[PDB]
């Protein structure tokens, strides 16, 4: 009922002194102006039990009035080949062949391969229309000639399709042939499949130059303007080895083509090997090679899934870098989005005296306001404070525009209560094509989202946002710490996980202590290495979260604003295709950190144990808390006092997600266990892994894994590591007007780490 | 040979799910009828904060909380901390259906959704 | 209470007419005679609610009396290198270097590498003694000289060890350096480790020829008469690149060896590359190459874990066939066993008229009896009946000598009741080293047992055995079908899953119908292909079980009696090592069939859904029941009746494990769903896979996945596939004296499948 | 630098598990006392066959059935279908410790384990 009327995004998450960040805005319609302003974020939790929302206006060269315009967003993934000279519209006979794997065969008109202008009905398209493969040509007069398949496509079955325009016979032809093997299709060789056919129809028009780009997985909407061809009628599923011949092919050739032969190669006008480019570093590029040698190279748009099982995949090798010949398929989705591709409305260059911190561009337009958050770093190669706070921007991308409560059947089961959503969750659902999906949702065709991009308006990034799990979630939740820091006078710097992945341990080493966000769930291998190296040589860390360093993640080297992640298991009932676990951006296996022998315990001291969101618990102290060696941590904290009863996140300092101490998974031997959390309902759940096999009673209050452990361990050169192991830890800082055990405990550690003296040994 | 048109074949598991859900809806209405105290238990503390739900209340939660999202209830924050309403998920691209009444707290709206999901099932029997 | 006094095994599972099978027997004391006779197995279940135990005595050449001797069994895995010429016992200086990874550093004395005679105390050994690495040499007088490590070994940390004998200095020297990286050891680079040392002690004795074999992971027991060097003092953990030098190394040489350098290569007397032999089909061999060029090749004994993470494994590649240089480790376990290596007691050449069927050698000796089951085939290349029963021998091996209720804490929780064991279980726990472990038990190390041998006494193979899940399991439970077939007078051959694997679909094609056992959980890839090709071309199958074709399995090409399986997840809390998922016997990925796009639904119609063993349920008929296309399946059954309410396995025809219909996983479209099962308690569990993410209420009676689906679909050329989808289906055949729905349905189908007319289409 | 001898470093998750088992044992005994009807419910049908355990009885089972194997009980078939005894698991290579009384059926033996397990937790308090 309330209407979000404007939204924006920036081109990059972090900017240091001297660098430039660009801002993009789109109003519901083009009229009036909006106001822009720079504000420093401080606290986003309007919960009345806490300190309420806080920000500060900063004078900036960017504030002012700007024309408000609507910016069209290109949605869905596809491949685009430039063809100004109309080379791919041969004046004579021609044929099109490809391999097909349709996931939404009945979801209305979908373009498989086209060089087609839909406004003039000109060119040629291969499309699914009414659940059938149709080959169509047009002359720009509005009349068309079509040949329609005899057998409707079966979902997720591999087909070889051949479309032929034969002007000699004034005839169109279509050759559909099913090429299912033991392992490439939904079902196997048992079922007696009659889905082959050869059909002909009369050709009553010439094919005309459509003046558009050639497309895979879509149709050109209208005559290209300024070079942009808009893609409509998005196809869902895979395409493999699409090629165009400069002659009409016959039954014989379509036969050979369906078995993998490259018939009449000299006559190929263009041939796209989607696997060309696969190396031991994967295929970290959008480039699409024209294997025919003709230079008609394409380009992936909106990150279709690369490194995907092809028509010939037989299952002997599951890593695409070791068998590219069987991974020549691209997986297209109508809801992919790697870049809104808007025109920038203004830009900003960080001036000298601007403190490193959390920032946003505040936008006012009519009776709506939007926040475009970004981050400011210190001048390159320097630090401006002793504390460094890592903004969990890899995790922000993972949950970017999450819509779990709208798409996941068990969404509320996991939450432990009917979720409380807001205006932002209604906007995502009305206009998905403006915002895109997260890695926790599924594509429309029931497959996990494995790419997520910063160059889009990310609504759950706004500080005043509240998330369905019970309160706030990621960036807003991290503002709990940013408020506690600023309230207690701590001078700190800020860097994103993207920056950690860029600079490595050299960044961390400029600080006495590095603080984690509330939920650093997603990390790059380089981030792991940087933390390990920093801590091993005198660094000091504070892991104020849980479920941190759980998923291995990669930053697209060609598109630093895209992140890739492939997961075995998700809340939404999306499939994890069998041979597609390895990342296209580095070729590595990825997945759970524990699975690559880098469990979180190995670096921060504790690792993922369970999750649950009906409410949070408190910490009861353990024997190690009265050890004289840690008396500095337990300052004004009586040994009988509960730690963290009460808070803005579920009402307790230990909940939402809980990490635990485990020697077998890498906890350093010299780790002390100061306290563990209690009061977890059966809503708290354990993820089945090699340590705990599923059985009745694998839930809170019934299994000893379901707790959070407060740990500390020392390292060489006066280093040390402190973990609270609860997402909701930072939610309890402000409790009782900052007079609580969770504040005293965190302060105790922080004051010790910023001291010019070694973290206490052991 | 024999399998030709994909529309001649339906996901026949829907026969089972329709029977499980029917048998399972009756199981829930009977639990409510024989343990009416759980409705009071929920209204007093819908989060289970410091007083975990009873086994029979949890059994009910386990059915409602796992239903398909389409047609499902969530709570919509009209004005946070002052006005909440009951939203019904509709197809992508559509706005939700909003119940008429406004509730002053999250807890109050949670119990309203609980009471309505119960009335909804009584209707289908 | 009472004492198992004798046990035996045979060399192979099945023999055809004219072939020989050998039998091996071991009594508690070498004294007296035992008796043996041949029996046809019919019914094993003694359940008084059932038809009781039944066997038939068969006159045979093998029946008679035999000397009863005790055969000592060589337990534990290791590497043996024959050295009859004392080449690996130098008379001058020498040095030994290796990388180790100890998983039981405190578990007594363990030989890491030795050419040692423990009886005379002669030779040299590198061993763990009292938690420290120790280098020792003896002359045979009983006196020895030892250098002992200053730093006790940390569990699962990689170390470089260099033992030196420097006679020119009358000195023993030991160099220990830890070589942990981000990914190869229990914990990582953060812990400030200090487990490095270089110690020396005085050498008062010379090293003498031990007249034994050189060993890795053990010590020679005594003078190797007969050429057999008995191995004792077993090592648990990994060894990588052991080598012997013919001179006295120094500090810098140990330093270089720890970084992987092959110092002073020509001085090498022997150097074992455990990775040599790894190709694209794995390393399917016990052979160990001598990389020094000196001919000292080794032999793996009792199947240690090959294809295992090495000291230099950094995690960039997880498939050993693609990075041999980082998989140069062997993982040894004190409780390995691939062959009892007993002396045969008697054999048996299958005579002409002997029917194909379940057989066993009955052994009487004092107050005890033992059965040695095996299987008789029809003459090679022929069939002697229209029905073929596939004995689940691959699954029998997976559960071979299971001790779940003795090792798995959650064992009883999964069972849904306190387990009821017997003398055969008491015997496994008391004399473990005669029997070995199953793939469900963990090694003492805590790693899953990934190899299981048929050449051992498999106690849970005996027909009178009852299993801890509540009734009976695998082979005895399969006799439920054998009895039903005999009671109704069906004529049938038998074959093992080993035979299917060897003969392919050519075997199935000899039969109108092929029947499954009660639990064909484990299958080779070739077996899946055989079924798929058989059903695609008129074969007719009966999947009378659940959880079939769940785990991909392989048969060791060198040791057809050994089976390899690597599971991501098991009952006992054994860690699945990070980079060791690929099978050593074929290099393929293996694991879950579903994960290789070959889920049970693709072949037999239904697939793993849930498990639970407190009791069984019954089937209620579904709308497809009253379909006329399957009137023949339902002929004698009333549309209102329950199906299978009552039985010997949990009291119901649908229980223990349940498979379900699922189009997305490969169920053929023309499948009909005849009935589903009900009355499953919270004990029934769901393995979280990509379609069932864990949440509260993922158990029986609360989630719609917990049911078994009775399905049927026709195939090309008169074929067809019937599935009941419940492990306890066969346990309900004899209920109420064979007068019940479970018998009627199975008979209706079978009668229809063995007719000389196509199975009804759909 | 500091981490030198592996015996100086115990597994400190044992401190948590000790505290957990204590709180969890009290929870069970107070469940048995607050709902004494469940002891009879188990005696009548330990398998739960056709009458699934009540939610409160299952919570007791969930604790007992997941306990460490060493020192745990199983049911030894001395004479199958005639005499069963309560076996206590000891180290590998050892006979189980055997109870004195013999039971005629597994159902009776299973409830005997149930009662003895309750008696054992009472004694540890
Ligand atoms: Fe997450
Ligand atoms: Fe199994």
| Cα C650 to Cα C653: distance, rounded to the nearest angstrom | 8
Give the start-end residues of each E strand in C622-653.
642-643
D83-88 sheet: strands from edge to edge: C420-421, D73-79, D83-88, D97-98
Provide DSSP, B1-24: --B--GGG---THHHHHHHHHHHH
**Cβ-defined contact of C151 to D95 (cutoff 8 Å):** no
D101: which 2 tokens? 């009384």
Q: Tell the residue number behind the tokens 């920056």, with chain if given.
A: A499
| Cα A458 to Cα A734: distance, rounded to the nearest angstrom | 27
Instruction: Tell whether B68 is within 8 A of chain D (Cβ).
Output: no
Strand-pairing partners, residue A287, are A299
Instruction: Tell whether D63 is within 8 A of chain A (Cβ).
Output: yes
Closest to C153 (Cα-Cα) out of C173, C180, C131 = C131
| Cα C608 to Cα C550: distance, rounded to the nearest angstrom | 7
**How far is the CA of C205 from the CAs of A718, C133, C142, C162, C245, in angstroms?**
47, 20, 10, 19, 19
Task: Using DSSP bridges, classify how beta strands A492-496 and A522-523 pair: parallel, antiparallel or unpaired.
Answer: unpaired
**Cβ-defined contact of A186 to C571 (cutoff 8 Å):** no
- Produce one character per residue of B36-56: b if its CB has 16 or more CB atoms within 10 Å, e if not: eebbebbeebbbbbeebbbeb
Q: What are φ and ψ of residue A501, in 5° steps?
A: -65, -25
Strand-pairing partners, residue A6, are A27
Provide DSSP, C721-735: EEE--BGGGGGGTTH
**Cβ-defined contact of B59 to D55 (cutoff 8 Å):** yes
3-state secondary structure of A52: coil
**Cβ-defined contact of B75 to A651 (cutoff 8 Å):** no
Which secondary structure element, helix H or strand E, spans residue A427, and what is its range? helix A423-430
What's the gap between Cα C759 and its chain centre? 37
Residues 6+ apart with CB under 8 A from A408: A414, A440, A441, A571, A572, A573, B69
Q: CA neighbours within 13 Å on the CB side: how many for A479? A: 31
Instruction: Tell whether B59 is within 8 A of chain D (Cβ).
Output: yes
| Cα A307 to Cα A291: distance, rounded to the nearest angstrom | 17
Answer yes or no: are the C-beta atoms of A585 and A554 closer than 8 Å. yes
Answer yes or no: are the C-beta atoms of C74 and C436 closer than 8 Å. no
Instruction: Tell whether D92 is within 8 A of chain C (Cβ).
Output: yes
User: How many angstroms separate the first and last alpha carbons of chain D?
Assistant: 44
The answer to whether the Cα torsion of A57, A59, A65, A69 is positive or negative is negative
Tell me the CATH architecture of domain A6-73+342-376: Sandwich (2.60)
| Cα C221 to Cα C211: distance, rounded to the nearest angstrom | 11
Nearest ligand, CA of residue C611? 2
| Cα A80 to Cα A297: distance, rounded to the nearest angstrom | 9
The answer to whether the Cα torsion of A349, A351, A352, A357 is positive or negative is negative
| Cα A303 to Cα C88: distance, rounded to the nearest angstrom | 60
C614: which 2 tokens? 């407190």
Note down the domain range covering B47. Answer: 12-123
3-state secondary structure of A686: coil
CA of A424 to the centre of ligand 1 (A): 20
Nearest ligand, CA of residue C398? 2
- To test the contact with chain D by mutation, choose from B54, B55, B56 the residue with the greatest count of D C-beta atoms within 10 A, namely B55
Q: What are φ and ψ of residue A37, in 5° steps?
A: -155, 155
Provide DSSP, C146-203: EEE-SSPPPTT-EEEEEEEEEGGGTEEEEEEEE---SSSSSS-TTS-B---EEEEEE-
Nearest ligand, CA of residue A657? 1
**Cβ-defined contact of A691 to C315 (cutoff 8 Å):** no
Instruction: Tell whether B58 is within 8 A of chain C (Cβ).
Output: yes
Chains with 3 or more CB pairs under 8 A to chain B: A, C, D
| Cα C502 to Cα A325: distance, rounded to the nearest angstrom | 30
**Overall fold of domain C6-73+340-376:** Immunoglobulin-like (2.60.40)
| Cα A669 to Cα A554: distance, rounded to the nearest angstrom | 31
| Cα C258 to Cα C197: distance, rounded to the nearest angstrom | 13
Closest to A268 (Cα-Cα) out of A300, A287, A288, A241 = A241
Residues across chain A: 762
State how many domains chain B has: 1
| Cα C566 to Cα C438: distance, rounded to the nearest angstrom | 12
Which residues of chain A have a CB within 8 Å of the CB of C692? Answer: 573
Provide DSSP, A371-404: EEEEEEPPSTT--SSSEEEEE-HHHHHHTTT--H
Distance from CA of B5 to the nearest CA of A (A): 6
Answer yes or no: are the C-beta atoms of A251 and A174 closer than 8 Å. no
| Cα C603 to Cα A444: distance, rounded to the nearest angstrom | 28
Give CA angle at D63 (D57, D65), nearest 5°: 95
Answer yes or no: are the C-beta atoms of C507 and C382 closer than 8 Å. no
Strand-pairing partners, residue C238, are C101, C331
Q: Tell the residue number behind the tokens 């004792």, with chain if given.
A: C232
Strand-pairing partners, residue C492, are C387
Identify the closest residue of chain C to A700 by CA–CA distance.
C696
CA of A609 to the centre of ligand 1 (A): 12
CA of A570 to the centre of ligand 2 (A): 25
Answer yes or no: are the C-beta atoms of C727 and C694 closer than 8 Å. no
Q: CA neighbours within 13 Å on the CB side: how many for C513? A: 27
Identify the closest residue of chain C to D111 by CA–CA distance.
C418
Residues 6+ apart with CB under 8 A from A278: A307, A320, A321, A324, A327, A587
Strand-pairing partners, residue C330, are C239
CA of B88 to the centre of ligand 1 (A): 26
Q: CA neighbours within 13 Å on the CB side: how many for C5? A: 15
Of A661, A695, A703, the CB nearest to D13: A661
C6-10 sheet: strands from edge to edge: C6-10, C20-27, C346-349
Task: Using DSSP bridges, classify how beta strands C14-15 and C368-376 pair: parallel, antiparallel or unpaired.
Answer: parallel
- To test the contact with chain D by mutation, choose from A675, A704, A758 the residue with the greatest count of D C-beta atoms within 10 A, namely A704
Closest to A110 (Cα-Cα) out of A136, A84, A90, A86 = A136
* Chain A / chain D CB contacts < 8 angstroms: 57
Provide DSSP, C297-331: -EEEES--EEEE--TT--SS---GGG-GGG--EEE
CATH of the domain spanning A78-332, picked from 3.40.50.620, 1.20.140.10, 2.60.120.200, 3.30.2130.30: 2.60.120.200
| Cα C153 to Cα A595: distance, rounded to the nearest angstrom | 25
Instruction: Tell whether B75 is within 8 A of chain A (Cβ).
Output: yes
- Is C521 assigned a ligand-binding role in the annotation? yes
Nearest ligand, CA of residue A469? 1
The answer to whether the Cα torsion of C704, C708, C714, C715 is positive or negative is positive
B60 found inside a domain: yes
Answer yes or no: are the C-beta atoms of A436 and A551 closer than 8 Å. no
Q: Tell the residue number behind the tokens 């129809």, with chain if given.
A: A201
C34: which 2 tokens? 């035992």
Which residues of chain C have a CB within 8 Å of the CB of D80? Answer: 46, 422, 466
- Is A521 assigned a ligand-binding role in the annotation? yes
- Produce one character per residue of C624-637: b if its CB has 16 or more CB atoms within 10 Å, e if not: bbeeeebeebbeeb
| Cα C275 to Cα C292: distance, rounded to the nearest angstrom | 14
- When computed from its CA atoms, the radius of gyration of chain D, rounded to whole angstroms, is 18
| Cα A526 to Cα A531: distance, rounded to the nearest angstrom | 9
**Cβ-defined contact of A622 to D6 (cutoff 8 Å):** no
- To test the contact with chain C by mutation, choose from B5, B6, B20 the residue with the greatest count of C C-beta atoms within 10 A, namely B20
**Cβ-defined contact of B109 to A418 (cutoff 8 Å):** yes
Closest to C100 (Cα-Cα) out of C160, C164, C150 = C160
Instruction: Tell whether B59 is within 8 A of chain C (Cβ).
Output: yes
Instruction: Tell whether D77 is within 8 A of chain A (Cβ).
Output: no
Answer yes or no: are the C-beta atoms of C591 and C522 closer than 8 Å. no
| Cα A582 to Cα C273: distance, rounded to the nearest angstrom | 30
Instruction: Tell whether D4 is within 8 A of chain C (Cβ).
Output: yes
**How far is the CA of A60 from the CAs of A9, A39, C532, in angstroms?**
18, 9, 70
| Cα A361 to Cα A378: distance, rounded to the nearest angstrom | 19
| Cα A609 to Cα A709: distance, rounded to the nearest angstrom | 10
CA of C447 to the centre of ligand 2 (A): 17
Instruction: Tell whether B35 is within 8 A of chain D (Cβ).
Output: no
| Cα D23 to Cα A701: distance, rounded to the nearest angstrom | 10
Please report, to the nearest 10 degrees, the dihedral formed by the alpha carbons of residues A363, A364, A369, A373 taken in order: 10
**Cβ-defined contact of A573 to C694 (cutoff 8 Å):** no
- Is A399 assigned a ligand-binding role in the annotation? yes
Answer yes or no: are the C-beta atoms of A239 and A216 closer than 8 Å. yes
**Cβ-defined contact of D66 to C466 (cutoff 8 Å):** no
Closest to C541 (Cα-Cα) out of C715, C762, C664, C393 = C715
| Cα A217 to Cα A109: distance, rounded to the nearest angstrom | 11
| Cα D65 to Cα D86: distance, rounded to the nearest angstrom | 15
* Chain A / chain B CB contacts < 8 angstroms: 117
C6-73+340-376 and C91-331 share one CATH topology?
no
Provide DSSP, C681-700: -TT-B----TT----TT-BT
| Cα C598 to Cα C529: distance, rounded to the nearest angstrom | 10
Answer yes or no: are the C-beta atoms of C231 and C221 closer than 8 Å. yes
Cβ burial of A325 (10 Å; 0-12, 13-18, 19+) is middle
What's the gap between Cα A435 and its chain centre? 12
Which residues of chain D have a CB within 8 Å of the CB of C437? Answer: none
CA of A597 to the centre of ligand 1 (A): 20
Answer yes or no: are the C-beta atoms of A711 and A671 closer than 8 Å. yes
Distance from CA of B44 to the nearest CA of A (A): 14
**How far is the CA of A536 from the CAs of A496, A719, A742, C188, in angstroms?**
21, 7, 27, 9
Which residues of chain D have a CB within 8 Å of the CB of B55? Answer: 55-56, 59
| Cα A440 to Cα A569: distance, rounded to the nearest angstrom | 10
Nearest ligand, CA of residue A399? 1
Q: Tell the residue number behind the tokens 């793993």, with chain if given.
A: C608
Instruction: Tell whether D51 is within 8 A of chain C (Cβ).
Output: no
Distance from CA of D56 to the nearest CA of B (A): 8
Residues 6+ apart with CB under 8 A from C599: C593, C607, C662, C665, C666
- To test the contact with chain D by mutation, choose from A697, A718, A761 the residue with the greatest count of D C-beta atoms within 10 A, namely A697
Domain boundaries, chain A: 6-73+342-376, 78-332, 538-550+598-762
Strand-pairing partners, residue A300, are A79
Taking the CB of residue C224, how many other CB atoms lie within 10 A of it?
17
Q: What are φ and ψ of residue A749, in 5° steps?
A: -65, -45
Chains with 3 or more CB pairs under 8 A to chain D: A, B, C
| Cα A185 to Cα C310: distance, rounded to the nearest angstrom | 37
Answer yes or no: are the C-beta atoms of A29 and A474 closer than 8 Å. no
Closest to C523 (Cα-Cα) out of C488, C547, C557 = C547
Answer yes or no: are the C-beta atoms of A370 and A361 closer than 8 Å. no
| Cα C314 to Cα C300: distance, rounded to the nearest angstrom | 26
Strand-pairing partners, residue A452, are A563
| Cα C300 to Cα C297: distance, rounded to the nearest angstrom | 10
Give CA angle at A635 (A750, A701), nearest 5°: 90
Taking the CB of residue A76, how many other CB atoms lie within 10 A of it?
23
Closest to C230 (Cα-Cα) out of C86, C335, C74, C434 = C74
Please report, to the nearest 10 degrees, the dihedral formed by the alpha carbons of residues A393, A396, A397, A401 taken in order: -160
**How far is the CA of C417 from the CAs of C79, C573, D75, in angstroms?**
43, 20, 10
| Cα A377 to Cα A459: distance, rounded to the nearest angstrom | 23
Taking the CB of residue D78, how many other CB atoms lie within 10 A of it?
17
Tell me the CATH architecture of domain C91-331: Sandwich (2.60)
| Cα C661 to Cα C622: distance, rounded to the nearest angstrom | 13
Closest to C78 (Cα-Cα) out of C211, C274, C324 = C274
Q: What are φ and ψ of residue A417, in 5° steps?
A: 180, 155
């Amino acid at each position: 009922m309330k209407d979000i009327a404007i939204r924006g995004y920036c081109d990059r998450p972090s900017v240091a002194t001297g660098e430039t960040i660009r801002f993009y805005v789109s109003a519901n319609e083009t009229r009036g102006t909006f106001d822009a302003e720079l504000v420093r974020l401080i606290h986003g939790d309007s919960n009345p039990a806490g300190p309420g929302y806080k920000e500060e206006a900063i004078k900036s060269d960017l504030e002012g009035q700007y024309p408000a315009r609507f910016q069209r967003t290109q949605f869905g993934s596809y491949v685009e080949v430039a063809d100004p000279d109309a080379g791919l519209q041969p004046d004579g006979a021609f044929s099109v062949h490809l391999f097909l794997w349709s996931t939404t065969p009945s979801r209305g008109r979908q373009g498989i391969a086209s060089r087609w202008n839909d406004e003039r009905q000109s060119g040629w398209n291969l499309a699914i229309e009414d659940g059938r493969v149709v080959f169509t040509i047009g002359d720009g007069s509005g009349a068309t000639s079509s040949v329609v398949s005899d057998r409707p496509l079966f979902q997720q079955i591999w087909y070889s399709i051949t479309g032929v325009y034969d002007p000699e016979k004034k005839q169109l032809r279509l050759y559909q042939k099913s090429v299912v093997n033991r392992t490439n299709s939904r079902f196997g060789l048992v079922v007696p499949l009659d889905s082959d056919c050869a059909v002909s129809a009369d050709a009553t028009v010439k094919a005309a130059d459509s003046e558009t780009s050639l497309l895979i997985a879509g149709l050109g909407e209208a005559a290209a303007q300024d070079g942009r061809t808009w893609c409509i009628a998005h196809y869902n599923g895979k395409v493999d080895a699409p090629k165009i011949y400069g002659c009409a092919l016959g039954q014989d050739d379509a036969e050979k083509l369906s078995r993998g032969e490259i018939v009449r190669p000299i006559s190929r006008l263009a041939h796209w090997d989607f696997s060309a480019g696969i190396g031991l570093n994967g295929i970290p590029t959008d480039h699409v090679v024209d294997a025919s040698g003709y230079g008609h190279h394409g380009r992936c748009m909106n990150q279709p899934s690369r490194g995907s099982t092809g028509w010939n995949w037989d299952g002997h090798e599951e890593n695409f870098i070791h068998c590219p010949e069987q991974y020549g398929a691209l997986w297209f989705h109508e809801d992919c989005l790697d870049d809104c591709r808007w025109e920038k409305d203004f830009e900003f260059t960080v001036p000298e005296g601007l403190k490193s911190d959390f920032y946003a561009v505040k936008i006012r337009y009519e009776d709506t306001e939007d926040y475009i958050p970004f981050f400011v770093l210190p001048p390159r190669g320097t630090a401006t404070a002793p504390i460094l706070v890592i903004a969990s921007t890899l995790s922000y991308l993972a949950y970017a525009n999450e819509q779990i409560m709208h798409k996941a059947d068990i969404g509320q089961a996991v939450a432990g209560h009917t979720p409380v959503l807001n205006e932002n969750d209604v906007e995502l659902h009305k206009n998905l094509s403006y915002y895109g999906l997260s890695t926790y949702d599924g594509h429309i065709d029931g497959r996990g989202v494995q790419y997520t991009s910063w160059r889009r308006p990310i609504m759950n990034l706004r500080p005043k946002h509240r998330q369905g799990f019970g309160s706030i979630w990621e960036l807003p939740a991290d503002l709990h710490l940013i408020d506690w820091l600023n309230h207690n006078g701590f001078e700190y710097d800020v860097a994103t996980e993207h920056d950690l992945n860029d600079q490595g341990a050299e960044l961390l080493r400029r600080y006495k202590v590095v603080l984690t966000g509330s939920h650093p769930e997603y990390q790059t291998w380089a981030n792991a290495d940087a933390w390990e190296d920093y801590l091993a040589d005198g660094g000091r860390g504070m892991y104020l979260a849980a479920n941190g360093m759980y998923w291995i993640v990669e930053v697209h080297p060609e598109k630093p604003w895209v992140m890739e992640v492939r997961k075995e298991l998700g809340v939404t009932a999306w499939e994890a295709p069998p041979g597609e676990y390895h990342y296209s951006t580095n070729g590595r296996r990825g997945g759970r950190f524990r699975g690559r022998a880098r469990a979180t315990q190995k670096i921060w001291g504790t690792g993922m144990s369970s999750f649950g969101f009906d409410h949070s618990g408190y910490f009861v102290q353990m024997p190690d808390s009265q050890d004289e060696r840690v008396a500095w941590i337990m300052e004004g904290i009586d040994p009988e006092e509960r730690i963290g009863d009460g808070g803005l996140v579920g009402g307790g300092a230990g909940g939402y997600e809980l990490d635990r101490y485990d020697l077998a998974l890498g906890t350093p031997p010299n780790t002390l266990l100061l306290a563990s959390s209690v009061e977890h309902s059966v809503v708290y759940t354990v993820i089945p892994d090699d340590k705990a096999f599923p059985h009745p009673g694998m839930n809170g209050g019934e299994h000893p894994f379901v707790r959070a452990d407060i740990t500390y361990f020392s390292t060489a050169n006066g280093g040390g590591m402190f973990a609270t192991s609860s997402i909701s830890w930072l939610g309890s800082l402000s409790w009782n007007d900052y007079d609580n055990n969770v504040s005293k405990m965190t302060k105790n550690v922080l004051n010790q780490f910023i001291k010019d003296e070694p973290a206490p040994r052991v | 040979s024999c399998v030709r048109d994909p529309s001649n074949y339906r996901d026949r598991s829907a026969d089972w799910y329709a029977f499980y859900d029917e048998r399972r809806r009756k199981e829930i209405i009977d639990i409510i009828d024989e343990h009416p105290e759980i409705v009071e238990e929920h209204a007093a503390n819908p989060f289970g904060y410091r007083k975990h739900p009873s086994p029979y209340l949890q059994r009910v939660h386990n059915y409602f909380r796992m239903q398909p999202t389409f047609g499902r209830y969530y709570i919509y924050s009209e004005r946070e901390w002052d006005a909440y309403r009951i939203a019904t998920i509709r197809e992508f691209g559509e706005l939700p259906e909003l119940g008429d009444e406004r509730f002053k707290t999250e807890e109050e709206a949670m119990h309203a959704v609980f009471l309505r999901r119960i009335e909804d099932v009584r209707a289908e029997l």
